[PDB]
Amino acid sequence: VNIVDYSDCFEGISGGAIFCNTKNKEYNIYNKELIETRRSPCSTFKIVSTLIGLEKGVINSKESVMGYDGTDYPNKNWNKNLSLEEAFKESCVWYYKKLINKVDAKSVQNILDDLKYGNCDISEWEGDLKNGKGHLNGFWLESSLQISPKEQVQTMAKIFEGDTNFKKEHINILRDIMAIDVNDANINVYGKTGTGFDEKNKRVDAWFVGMLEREGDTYYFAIKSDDSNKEITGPKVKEIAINIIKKYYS
């Protein structure tokens, strides 16, 4: 377990990082206190909810659709019968809300418990209704479910090392749709951003969680900001993560 200084890459933004290679159990940690602190996963939960939907047969493949009903949304790309692959990359809220609401709460509870997914607290199934966004809410978006960056890495590793009961075919669908292009063909990067604002503490929850493969070695990682600046988003934290990968993991 190595404590490291990645502050140079964070360019003044408050956050932490954890990279884990489970082959040689090398844990690299920047800001250990933050890395151990549970927060809402926000849209990073789509990694797990995709697998839930696949396992329960709500969806079947990266082409699978959820039956768009014509509702008007400001994001162009949400206004169509988009596939799993597109809904994942566009973080289409209605697609993933419809998906999870076809699954009974006990099945979700048991999968989160099996994955050790943070506090596994789905008690506020409907999410943070006080923000006014109604059905564009859920337990995973600044609501009851909370997970630490370290626990995210532990979950990612369990899934992608094949230590869960999720089907290999379903894991590979997730892998496909999480693949990122980082303009470096000598590393494969996979991940998902998340963005939320913690109203209680007046800080962002900005995430980039995923994995990294470079010549036989795989690193599971989670980068997380808790800055008080609302301009700090998951996309911004993904930039930071990419800088760290290019600097230290090439």
Ligand SMILES: *C(=O)N1C[C@H](NOS(=O)(=O)O)CC[C@H]1C(N)=O
């Ligand atoms: C998830 O974090 N969300 C869904 C969507 N995607 O965010 S991302 O660009 O960080 O991946 C918009 C923000 C957020 C939400 N408010 O639902």
